[PDB]
Ligand binder design. Structure first.
Ligand SMILES: *Cc1c(COP(=O)(O)O)cnc(C)c1O
Ligand SMILES: *Cc1c(COP(=O)(O)O)cnc(C)c1O
Ligand SMILES: [Cl-]
Ligand SMILES: [Cl-]
Ligand SMILES: [Mg+2]
Ligand SMILES: [Mg+2]
Ligand SMILES: [Mg+2]
Ligand SMILES: [Mg+2]
Ligand SMILES: [Mg+2]
Lengths: 389, 379
């Protein structure tokens, strides 16, 4: 039992970690994983989780174990990490830059079934010319703009859809599908508006696929998604897969959109109280914006949580206390309502540990080299995640 | 050689000639004021950047985390001030650094934190050097500049408890809400006077107070005189940023840190160029939104570093930035001006926030080559 005794001596808990730390409540993370996978199984579509929220091998392993099919990545560094870890079905869902083609070629030549996306004739021409030069039939999907959010060919822009699809297909590449991301779902906050946007996202992606196929071009995959529209879609006829990422943890922006409650948020930042300004009702904590990130997505929503909702050590919300301000390594904990708490030092004594729910899980997670994955027994384990490009 | 044409994007680029000018300007101002400069490395967390600050005449550093103290001590820097109210649970970490030879200084602003340090120091045989943080402007931590009984209670806990009461410090961070030389000069004087007043109160009580330490970059550059001050702490000046430009202490052309980005697409009807520098590259900091000129997620510059006024990142998602006209109009033929693959450089709202998004900087020399300069992430 030499290993056992030594490992027990080294095991951390929420009391022994240094702060700040990004804590994943594994039981909440597994409920979120199951909820999404079950919804997609009920819809008869594949779930291709977007790992840009955690960039962590063990978190994606849990998603794969639950039934996910492949992943979506936001950078080729994520494709390199997850392919090294055994994931071969990877979609790089950012408009392809020609200068990154040698790295995408190398990944495919090592055995990664890496898919790229474009939304322009010039990007299609760059991929097809390099593929012909290098003897590589890249798989390329066409990105569709279904809601005005960001990149993509308009769903009704048949001439440009065909021009890009022909450039790829005639060029000897594999035109593998269409995808869309209805990111404007983050501006909504009612179930009726989310359900309608989910239907516009489905209808527009399938419209683009049907236009390509009406021109004789292959388009076997139809991929949609954002977490809110994944959870709100009534029907997904014509869709092969849904992509969703932030759901794995949720956050307060998702709580305000209405697709989860604060009790579903699996990621919190463990912080210590390091001081006060008693006459202003401030407790000062060691989670500033370097821990929380500068994300303030809740500022324009129905309930502004400042730099995060305060919870006790046990992870239960402490209503009315939020981080009202943040500097790099100092957070200002005070009443959301703008009163000065009396006796703030008795409410929050020096050295008290608290947990802060984030505005945006993807933004807060990226501030940490690793998560501390919290098991039901109170034990944590360090789960590394990727930083940079 | 690696150059701005060969790097992958996004990348954090330091223009070394601009950084050296910013380093010289600050050190020459501190020398003119008769005070030491103790740079705050939380902006770069990079050994070669702090080396350049030391070569120019800096005396010790300030750090925002013990991880920084570990990094810089492993690189040979021993005169380290950890300028965040000390948490008692980090005392074992601080003790081990001191026992290894790091001359690590801690700060406190409460009797309870001072008692925890003094009790642990006596148990472990360690006379911790502790400074008392003074609140001169209501920004953040510190003993109020008027609150003499609290100041003396802490000073006596430390000195009677066997610890080394090494000084007082203040950080007038409310300087970042100002934007005129008269208001910055007045706040710099309030910061100076408040910190010197606390030192005098300690000394009048028979307590040691050899160091009087003030600073933020705007008050460091605006102070007219620094009588009674021994050192100034400043950090973001090494690179500057657009929040600094709006406060009025630099020009956009002085900003030494930019994010190299590639154009990866367009929305021509809206006049957008989409770049691969989203908020993961720039950070979510939007400090210019509250100032007199809003630069969105950053100011566009060409690959040579020429500022392109009127183009900014008007929006950002994680790995996509939206480049568009600041005047709200849809640039006609945006794709013809910025073809796919064009490289641009984006000046940040907040240098300390943008830098923390990158594992390393790319230090750009006069000949156009780059050298990778690692920086620290995490705690
Ligand atoms: C982020 C992202 C997703 C996942 O959206 P969430 O709302 O985080 O689930 C899907 N597709 C693309 C292209 C994305 O960038
Ligand atoms: C950040 C910081 C500084 C340096 O301020 P800048 O405006 O970045 O130069 C000085 N002192 C303390 C305590 C700080 O936190
Ligand atoms: Cl700060
Ligand atoms: Cl995003
Ligand atoms: Mg997100
Ligand atoms: Mg690389
Ligand atoms: Mg006060
Ligand atoms: Mg700063
Ligand atoms: Mg540490």
């Amino acid at each position: 039992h030499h290993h056992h005794h030594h490992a027990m001596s080294m095991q951390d808990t929420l009391l022994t970690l240094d702060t700040p730390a990004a804590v994943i409540d594994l039981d909440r993370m597994q409920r979120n994983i199951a909820r999404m996978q079950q919804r997609m199984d009920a819809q008869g579509v594949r779930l291709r989780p977007h790992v840009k929220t955690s960039k962590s091998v063990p978190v994606a392993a849990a998603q794969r174990a639950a039934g996910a099919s492949g992943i979506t990545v936001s950078t080729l560094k994520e494709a390199e990490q997850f392919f090294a870890a055994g994931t071969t079905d990877i979609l790089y869902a950012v408009s392809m830059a020609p200068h990154r083609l040698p790295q995408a070629l190398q990944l495919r030549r090592r055995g990664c079934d890496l898919k790229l996306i474009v939304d322009s004739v010039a990007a299609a021409q760059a991929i097809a010319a390099f593929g012909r030069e290098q003897g590589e039939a890249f798989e390329v999907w066409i990105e569709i703009d279904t809601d005005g959010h960001r990149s993509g060919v308009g769903a009704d822009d048949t001439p440009l859809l065909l021009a890009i699809g022909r450039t790829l297909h005639d060029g000897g590449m594999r035109l593998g599908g269409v995808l869309t991301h209805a990111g404007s779902s983050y501006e909504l906050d009612t179930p009726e508006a989310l359900q309608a946007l989910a239907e516009r996202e489905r209808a527009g992606c399938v419209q683009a696929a049907e236009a390509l196929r009406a021109a004789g071009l292959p388009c076997p995959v139809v991929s949609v998604g954002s977490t809110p529209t994944a959870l709100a879609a009534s029907r997904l006829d014509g869709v092969t897969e849904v992509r969703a990422g932030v759901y794995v943890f949720f956050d307060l922006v998702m709580r305000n959109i209405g697709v989860c409650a604060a009790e579903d948020v699996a990621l919190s930042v463990l912080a210590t109280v390091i001081g006060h300004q008693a006459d202003k009702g401030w407790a000062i904590v060691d989670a500033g914006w370097m821990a929380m990130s500068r994300d303030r997505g809740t500022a324009r929503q129905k309930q502004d949580f400042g730099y995060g909702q305060v919870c006790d050590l046990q992870g239960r919300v402490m209503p009315g206390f939020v981080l009202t301000g943040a500097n790099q390594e100092h957070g200002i904990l005070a009443r959301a309502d703008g009163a000065a708490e009396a006796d703030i030092a008795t409410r929050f004594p020096l050295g008290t540990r608290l947990r802060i729910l984030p505005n945006h899980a993807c933004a807060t997670g990226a501030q940490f080299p690793a998560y501390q994955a919290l098991a039901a027994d109170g034990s944590v384990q360090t789960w590394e995640r990727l930083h940079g490009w």
